[PDB]
Ligand binder design. Structure first.
Ligand SMILES: Cc1cc2nc3c(=O)[nH]c(=O)nc-3n(C[C@H](O)[C@H](O)[C@H](O)COP(=O)(O)OP(=O)(O)OC[C@H]3O[C@@H](n4cnc5c(N)ncnc54)[C@H](O)[C@@H]3O)c2cc1C
Ligand SMILES: Cc1cc2nc3c(=O)[nH]c(=O)nc-3n(C[C@H](O)[C@H](O)[C@H](O)COP(=O)(O)OP(=O)(O)OC[C@H]3O[C@@H](n4cnc5c(N)ncnc54)[C@H](O)[C@@H]3O)c2cc1C
Ligand code: SF4
Ligand code: SF4
Ligand code: SF4
Ligand code: SF4
Ligand code: SF4
Ligand code: SF4
Ligand code: SF4
Ligand code: SF4
Ligand code: SF4
Ligand code: SF4
Ligand code: SF4
Ligand code: SF4
Ligand code: FES
Ligand SMILES: [Fe+3]
Lengths: 184, 652, 291, 138, 149, 187, 187
């Protein structure tokens, strides 16, 4: 039993605004072109071993079922772009999923591992930073002990920290600069 | 004579008035030179509005009227008649588009939209002053029609016109008339044989005293205008004497070269000497010189001595008053939808190929069989919307007949093999006409045909068996299906026929976004084209079924018979003409006209240009290109347009 | 050819042998790889794109700016980084509202993207600008073995912006691996995803492993001796995932995993020690015996 | 404080229909343009565009049928040769090439027209007013 | 203006009559032969390029001759002397901007025999001095009579 | 007298329904429902519109495009499910539509300010008198019977008597205009 | 002589082939039996009155009369209600173009009303049709409006006084008209 009171009518519009100007108004507004054909679900490799049904995500978005933002299902898409390549209505399915995930992140629906990944880029400029074994491997392989990357460049790390603060990405992940760690 | 103008500002209820301050535009209009009257009214195209103009034309002795309202493309004729009824020449009337072009696109900028409306009124008034009274041109109509395309649509047009007593010429590209209908076994929703309805019509048309059928022929050139077209028909060489030919086919048994049969969609093998299908009209044979080895074996068995390899194509010149384009359509090529594997997997076929397979007179003898092993399929899957309702292949339209023919052929397969399991993969079942929903109900309740709501994602062949697997989501269950089948049928959409490009260029007609030919107006002129004396009938105008195509054929015959019955038609005088006192015969205009109207001539010992009024369609290209200004298009004179440009910034 | 070599994360900090392999292989093909100093995570669209699109593009543009300042185009051996930087570049060229937003953020760090950067995936750079013929000319040790070619998803898709041909039936990688004397074996659902993308490996590990396992099973049934990818993410999933499949499901394959640069390195007579096959979770020794 | 003055020239068979379709669909676009109707874009010649700049046009727009779809077969092919020379002539006269815009828009393409109007308005607004009339009025 | 024309105009005014100038364009007076099929321009040449035929219209030969957009009366001494008309008498009474009409005519007939495929960039790439080619004697009377600086 | 903020269109009302004796498709209801939804959105963009349907039949030129447009441009929503019942709130006058969202396998009970029933087409009341005067027959759908659905779509079995428009069967304006022209030719 | 073995046999006895075959034999024999005693008859050649009759003044009927009148045939158009236009006159806009319905229909209503070859009988009904193809004798009842047709200005000032309110059929029972009325403004 789904009543009007359990629905958020502006969810589609809300997904579109989250996608404007990146990936684009025309890109994310494409969800309104969906005619629920199922080609996306049939093409989904993730859908073949789970309860995840790509078409239902778009349906929930158009109907206004907020629970889609709290779902673990939207996080099962690998961004393989098959649905994006086969949709007969030009829906930019993969991009809409990513934008829905943005709204999910804003609600606090972010896995701890994903927040950790985000924290590594914030603290060391890299999702998979160099460790003691990296230096030793690179040395034995004939490469420079430390790659010419942001991890070893304070100028570049500081540049990133300025952009992160300006984008509010630090608040999104719940990072405390004073403590140098995430909250919750 | 000094211009006396009447400016009328329409509110169109609130469509204009709600955004544009119409009373303010009217006040502004009065500040322009020559404006004697200016009035604002709720609906100018209504009886009160038209009577208001007619009364004012007489009471204020006006010689120019300006209607600031909607588009001339909608009401120009209405207001032309309105002013002409009051005695004012219709070409002294000028339309100002302040609705589609202003109030409807500047709804949130009322002040600026009012300012824009004022300028558009001023631009119109500026051109109005220099407008001139023009008289339509009267031309005679040759009592003869030309129908291009011998399908059910063209045949219907030719029969009705011939039955009305009009000499009609029917040109058919292939060696036989009948079109795609001839290729179908049965036709929905009555499940009649295609032959049931089509063959008697083919028979009648071939022996009609008022219809000259030119089969295996093509229109190669069309010149002139409505009522005066000069057409060139190329009677292609069959290499057989039609008057001598019996159509027995003793020759077909002797010919040693095998050619893939186009009628059977490459699923049949014909000979170099052939008859498209057994019920073909004319029941005559043809020689494909592209594959003939000239052994002369067929000639040894032909009794009447009809085979002649020295046959040359004949160019026939004919004069027609009207032309009906009924060239039909072609089936979409699904190779592009690589996921469905057409052209890769042997057991994936198109529905048109299936029609030929299921037709008794087909290559497989009316037996539906797998092309990989020749075995009859126990499980069949129909995939709907193949090449339609799909932006990836550029066809965002519904091909109209695919839901119905898929259900029809499924009924036909069940009658021949009840044990056959048939599943139709669809999005929407479009059984929209008389008896269609009933036909749909019947397919499921009577024949047990199953329906899966889910556009398939892909088809996968088992290389060892040749069987196919259809991957699709059963949207009504929220589950993924992966059902195996012995044969997959792709319900291919309709696309314009290959020759459409050649015909478009010959007739001078346009195409809609779906690439099919464009009708004058969708709602009120469904078979006329914007090109006078040129009409459409059937699938070349858009995807549709036999009931609709036959109705269009009849409709086109009526519309095309109007000029023929009148025997006289009028043409717009917004044409080009040369001022002989200014033209020094520079010759720049001649090659600019695609209709060859401007021609150089000797007049009073000197060379000057002269437009042949009847050949001018009124584009305005050559006057625009004339360096002396001697050439002008009435109603779009350079001075008239110059004043219109000044009008945007100031009063002229 | 001169290109700013974008490194990413996994290749330079984990599978460093891929970096070494690329450097020599590209030098042998005549490509000058210049250091893109201070480059950061692309950033990974799986987490950043999924968390905040504005953050993904701004940080990607910041990296694009490094190569633009250098007056050269970018080259990468990772599909993830290729997709991230390529899609970012296309968007900054096609969308002015997005460009304006990003440059207003980059102004705070004294940067400004001007749209002159082209992003290239080394496989297509080898296929369209160098030529497959040049790969064979440099083959010192022909690798006569069967390869389960894994194209990945972010290499040819989305086709509407990549323009690298068909994503359903591609030949690009198959022709590059076959030039080393190998054979690209045809296998079931060849173009399907490995399962790691879009943050699935991290948040839904068992689901990712299920897809990887299907791909490995299909490749083994097709008679493959190993799998070749063009993506450190695919690489980690195939390599480290085989240990996870063993620890969870109990299925063992010991199926060698190689990155194309490592495969091309072997082909060009490189020392397997320099390709760092020792840090791989699944031993490449069985494949090294076959070559 | 200043709004661009843009004049348009649209053929009756396509762009004029395209522009009407934008209105039917309530496709909002900036109110700078004022369209002049001609039967074909082939009617458009250099003097009409140069006359518009003389009068004080900040931008000049021209719309005709898609190449190959002219209601009069080849009228737009002539206009296409005329506009290319005109772009260069305007640069020689100190008028930014961008102040002139020509596009091929069919009658059904209302969205394209709306976007072409939006893009052209922004282009001219960014360039600022064309100072020709002020220079001549001295 | 030719001496006879000056006398004709002054004389008419002394008599009280209103003076009337010739109305046609120069090709009427030009003694060069024109193709009956109409004008077709294949290439555009600068006056020093090649050796022009003395009988054929210089515009059909590829030279920018302004006679088509120039008022008659002079007697066409320039084409008769072997050089194209420079348009010194100005436009006819039905043409405000001579240069604009000349460009229109020239662009219209350029590659008219291959109308649909001819490159529309050959002409602007070939004429390296457009104003000097079409407004030698009339720039101040043109719609755009100056260069914006 | 208040303007409705939420509207529901119920498709196939009096069509494709054996309980009311109309087992045919009325042909124009899918299209006019989407059309009027666009007109309501143009006049009031804040209005939420939901169309309860089984099949969207946008089968002719520009129809599928019109359908695509209603959703992409106007944001008109579509629910695949024929409603079971409508229930009025006697306190407000608001209506509740009970229907299954078949594409989710869940029951919806959305509230609306106005419910529009997309009524089908039936023969005009005078059809009985006109039938008796001309001596023509009727098809199972109660509309007038054509000589043959394909061999003669506007002729009747009665010589010199023809049909044109909706009296012959449910159809839109162009189809009716085409029949009018066809009948003129045949007649 | 025709023997119907398809609609009357093969299509209704599909699961009883042997009995269908036996039934076809009897029908052939029944036909052969009548055939033996059939006689040669001369088809009656009858003249055709050069005049057409269109019953119904909607977009379909208007189109038929316009085409016929344009062909030069005297045509009679009978319309039941006080005005032509049909249901299309009641519509606001028309899909798929969203054109104004009456704004595109009125010009045709006007053309028909002043067509030199069309005699429009509005507020009239065909009450009897006798004869056969080419020779029909038709009776049209020109209903009484109870208002002088020629002296009628159509201003509408006599309706204010009328004390009887009747539901307006044109407005589908929403609106309220008087005993003395007009169907719609563009009538
Ligand atoms: C698989 C399939 C099944 C179908 N089933 C049904 C059904 O069951 N019932 C139904 O009502 N409809 C059905 N249709 C639709 C039906 O095919 C069309 O409505 C019908 O063929 C329309 O005929 P037409 O005259 O308009 O065009 P066509 O049938 O295509 O005929 C065109 C004719 O013009 C000729 N021609 C082409 N170009 C030229 C040229 N340049 N010069 C001269 N002549 C030319 C062709 O040779 C051809 O004879 C089906 C369609 C398909 C694809
Ligand atoms: C709600 C709705 C919305 C629609 N929207 C659209 C749309 O947007 N676009 C579209 O194309 N189509 C639309 N249609 C379909 C459209 O209404 C029909 O196509 C059209 O009305 C058919 O015209 P017609 O002449 O055949 O019948 P009608 O329009 O009904 O005309 C019949 C005429 O004959 C008269 N008449 C009746 N009985 C007699 C008699 N015994 N004697 C004399 N005269 C008689 C009537 O008074 C009437 O004037 C819609 C239909 C409905 C119900
Ligand atoms: S493939 Fe496209 S139209 Fe179909 S259900 Fe998915 S997003 Fe919707
Ligand atoms: S992009 Fe995501 S939703 Fe689409 S098919 Fe791939 S995994 Fe499924
Ligand atoms: S004249 Fe045009 S704008 Fe005015 S009421 Fe009529 S349709 Fe509407
Ligand atoms: S043998 Fe002669 S008469 Fe017989 S069908 Fe062949 S060509 Fe015709
Ligand atoms: S001569 Fe030609 S048509 Fe006759 S049998 Fe030989 S190949 Fe066939
Ligand atoms: S008629 Fe049916 S199968 Fe064909 S395009 Fe339309 S919805 Fe698809
Ligand atoms: S272009 Fe003008 S001046 Fe030249 S021949 Fe034609 S009408 Fe005469
Ligand atoms: S105006 Fe157009 S159609 Fe008329 S003569 Fe000149 S070029 Fe030809
Ligand atoms: S040379 Fe010049 S003046 Fe003489 S005919 Fe040619 S264009 Fe005219
Ligand atoms: S340049 Fe002057 S004198 Fe010479 S031909 Fe031209 S107008 Fe006559
Ligand atoms: S046209 Fe649409 S709403 Fe109408 S009966 Fe058919 S499916 Fe139902
Ligand atoms: S008052 Fe009534 S009856 Fe008299 S003329 Fe006016 S509308 Fe007709
Ligand atoms: S008619 Fe539009 S360009 Fe010729
Ligand atoms: Fe109107």
């Amino acid at each position: 039993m789904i009543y009007s009171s359990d629905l958020n009518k502006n969810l589609a519009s809300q997904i579109i605004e989250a996608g404007t100007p990146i990936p684009g108004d025309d890109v994310v507004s494409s969800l309104k072109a969906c005619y629920q054909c199922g080609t996306c679900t049939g093409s989904c490799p993730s859908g073949r071993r789970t309860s995840y049904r790509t078409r239902k995500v778009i349906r929930k978005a158009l109907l206004g079922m907020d629970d889609v933002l709290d779902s673990d299902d939207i996080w099962k898409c690998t961004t393989c772009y098959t649905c994006y390549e086969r949709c007969p209505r030009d829906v930019k399915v993969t991009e809409i999923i990513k934008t829905i995930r943005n709204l999910a992140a804003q609600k606090g629906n972010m896995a701890k591992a994903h927040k950790m990944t985000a924290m590594y880029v914030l603290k060391y400029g890299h999702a998979v930073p160099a460790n003691k074994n990296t230096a030793e491997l690179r040395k034995s392989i004939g490469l420079s002990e430390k790659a010419p990357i942001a991890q070893f460049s304070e100028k570049d790390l500081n540049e990133m920290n300025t952009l992160i603060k300006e984008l509010g990405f630090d608040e999104l992940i719940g990072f405390d600069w004073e403590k140098g760690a995430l909250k919750e | 004579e000094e211009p006396r103008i009447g400016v009328y500002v329409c509110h169109c209820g609130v469509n204009i008035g709600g955004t544009v301050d119409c009373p303010d535009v009217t006040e502004f209009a009065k500040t322009l030179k020559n404006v004697v009257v200016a009035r604002d009214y709720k609906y100018m195209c209504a009886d009160p509005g038209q009577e208001m103009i007619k009364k004012d034309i007489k009471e204020h002795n006006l010689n120019r009227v300006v209607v600031a309202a909607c588009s001339p493309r909608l009401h120009e004729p209405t207001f032309r008649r309105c002013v002409a009824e009051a005695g004012l020449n219709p070409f002294l009337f000028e339309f100002a588009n302040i609705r589609e072009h202003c109030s409807w696109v500047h709804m949130h900028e009322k002040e600026k939209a009012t300012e824009k409306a004022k300028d558009l009124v001023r631009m119109a008034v500026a051109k109005a002053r220099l407008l001139e009274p023009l008289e339509f041109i009267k031309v005679g109509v040759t009592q003869r029609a030309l129908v291009i395309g011998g399908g059910v649509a063209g045949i219907q047009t030719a029969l009705d016109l011939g039955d009305m007593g009009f000499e009609t010429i029917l040109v058919e590209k292939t060696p036989s008339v009948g079109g795609r209908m001839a290729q179908l076994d049965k036709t929905f929703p009555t499940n009649d044989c295609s032959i049931c309805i089509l063959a008697p019509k083919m028979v009648d048309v071939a022996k009609h005293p008022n219809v000259k059928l030119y089969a295996y022929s093509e229109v190669v050139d069309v010149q002139g205008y409505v009522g005066n077209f000069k057409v060139k028909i190329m009677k292609k060489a069959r290499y057989i004497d039609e008057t001598k030919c019996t159509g027995c086919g003793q020759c077909s048994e002797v010919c040693p070269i095998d050619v893939p049969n186009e009628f059977d969609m490459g699923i049949g093998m014909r000979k170099a000497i052939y008859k498209p299908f057994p019920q073909a009209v004319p029941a005559k044979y043809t020689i494909d010189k592209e594959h003939c080895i000239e052994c002369g074996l067929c000639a040894k068995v032909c009794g009447p001595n009809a085979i002649d390899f020295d046959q040359e194509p004949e160019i026939i010149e004919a004069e027609v008053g009207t032309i009906i384009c009924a060239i039909g359509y072609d089936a979409f090529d699904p190779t592009v939808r690589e996921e469905y594997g057409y052209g890769v997997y042997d057991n994936v076929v198109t529905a048109l190929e299936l029609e030929r397979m299921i037709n008794a007179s087909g290559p497989t003898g009316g037996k539906v069989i797998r092309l990989s092993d020749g075995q009859k399929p126990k499980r069949i899957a129909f995939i709907q919307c193949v090449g339609s309702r799909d932006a990836k292949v550029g066809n965002k339209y519904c091909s109209n007949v695919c839901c119905m023919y898929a259900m029809k052929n499924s009924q036909l397969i069940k009658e021949k093999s009840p044990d056959t399991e048939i599943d139709i993969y669809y999005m929407d079942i479009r059984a929209f006409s008389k008896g269609y929903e009933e036909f749909y109900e019947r397919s499921a309740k009577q024949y047990g045909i199953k329906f899966m709501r889910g556009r398939p994602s892909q088809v996968i062949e088992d290389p060892e068996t040749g069987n196919l697997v259809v991957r699709a989501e059963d949207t009504l269950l929220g589950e993924i299906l992966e059902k195996e089948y012995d044969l997959v049928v792709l319900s291919v959409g309709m696309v314009p026929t290959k020759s459409a490009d050649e015909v478009q260029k010959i007739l001078g007609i346009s195409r809609t976004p779906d690439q099919f030919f464009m009708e004058a107006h969708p709602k009120l002129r469904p078979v006329d084209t914007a090109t006078d004396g040129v009409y459409l009938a059937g699938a070349c105008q858009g995807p549709k079924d036999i009931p609709a195509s036959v109705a269009q054929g009849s409709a086109a015959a009526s519309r095309a018979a109007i000029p023929l019955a009148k025997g006289e038609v009028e043409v717009e005088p917004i044409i080009a003409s040369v001022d002989a006192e200014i033209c020094g015969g520079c010759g720049v205009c001649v090659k600019q006209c695609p209709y060859g109207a401007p021609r150089l001539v000797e007049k009073d010992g000197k060379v000057v240009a002269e437009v042949i009024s009847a050949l001018c369609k009124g584009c305005g290209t050559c006057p625009a290109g004339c360096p002396s200004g001697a050439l002008e298009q009435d109603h779009f004179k350079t001075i008239q347009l110059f004043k219109q440009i000044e009008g945007m910034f100031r009063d002229t | 050819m001169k290109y700013a070599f974008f490194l990413g994360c996994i290749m330079p900090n984990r599978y460093a042998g891929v970096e070494a392999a690329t450097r020599t292989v590209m030098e042998k093909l005549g490509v000058e790889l210049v250091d893109m100093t201070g480059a950061s995570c692309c950033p990974a669209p799986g987490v950043f794109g999924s968390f905040d699109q504005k953050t993904w593009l701004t940080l990607a543009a910041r990296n694009l700016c490094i190569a633009e300042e250098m007056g050269v185009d970018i080259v990468t051996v990772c599909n993830g980084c290729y997709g991230s930087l390529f899609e970012a570049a296309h968007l900054l060229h096609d969308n002015k509202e997005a460009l304006n937003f990003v440059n207003e953020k980059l102004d705070k760090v004294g940067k400004e993207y001007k749209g002159n950067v082209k992003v290239r995936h080394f496989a297509e750079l080898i296929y369209n600008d160098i030529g497959v013929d040049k790969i064979a000319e440099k083959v010192e040790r022909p690798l006569n073995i069967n390869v389960g070619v894994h194209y990945g998803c972010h290499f040819l898709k989305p086709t509407d912006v990549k323009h690298l041909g068909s994503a359903e039936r591609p030949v690009m990688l198959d022709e590059i691996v076959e030039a080393t004397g190998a054979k690209s074996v045809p296998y079931a659902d060849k173009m399907m995803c490995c399962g790691a993308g879009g943050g699935v490996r991290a948040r839904e590990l068992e689901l990712s492993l299920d897809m990887t396992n299907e791909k490995i099973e299909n490749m083994i049934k097709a008679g493959a001796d190993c799998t070749v990818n063009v993506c450190p993410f695919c690489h980690l999933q195939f390599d480290r995932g085989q240990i996870e499949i063993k620890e969870k499901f109990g299925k063992e394959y010991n199926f060698p995993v190689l990155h194309l640069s490592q495969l091309l390195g072997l082909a060009m007579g490189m020392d397997p020690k320099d390709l760092a096959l020792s840090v791989h979770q699944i031993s490449v020794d069985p494949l090294l015996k076959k070559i | 404080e200043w709004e661009p003055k843009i004049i348009g020239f649209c053929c009756n068979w396509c762009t004029y229909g395209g522009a009407d379709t934008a209105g039917v669909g309530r496709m909002q676009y900036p109110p700078s343009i004022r369209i002049i109707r001609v039967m074909c874009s082939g009617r458009i010649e250099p003097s009409l565009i140069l006359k518009a700049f003389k009068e004080g046009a900040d931008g000049v727009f021209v719309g005709g049928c898609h190449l190959g779809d002219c209601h009069y077969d080849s009228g737009n092919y002539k206009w296409q040769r005329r506009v290319m020379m005109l772009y260069e002539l305007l640069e020689e006269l100190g008028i930014e090439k961008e102040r002139l815009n020509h596009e091929w828009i069919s009658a059904s393409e209302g969205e394209k027209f709306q976007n072409t109007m939006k893009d052209f308005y922004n282009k001219i607004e960014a360039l600022g007013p064309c100072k020709l009339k002020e220079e001549l009025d001295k | 203006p030719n001496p006879e024309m000056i006398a004709e105009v002054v004389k008419a005014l002394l008599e009280g009559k209103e003076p009337e100038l010739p109305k046609k364009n120069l090709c009427e007076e030009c003694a060069r032969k024109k193709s009956e099929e109409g004008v077709a321009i294949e290439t555009i040449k600068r006056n020093y390029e090649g050796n022009p035929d003395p009988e054929k219209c210089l515009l059909e030969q590829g030279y920018i001759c302004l006679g088509i957009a120039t008022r008659e009366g002079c007697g066409a001494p320039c084409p008769s002397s072997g050089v194209p008309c420079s348009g010194c008498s100005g436009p006819t009474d039905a043409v405000v901007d001579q240069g604009a009409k000349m460009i229109s005519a020239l662009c219209s007939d350029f590659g008219i025999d291959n109308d649909r495929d001819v490159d529309p960039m050959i002409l602007p790439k070939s004429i390296k001095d457009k104003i000097g080619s079409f407004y030698k004697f009339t720039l101040p009377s043109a719609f755009v009579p100056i260069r914006l600086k």
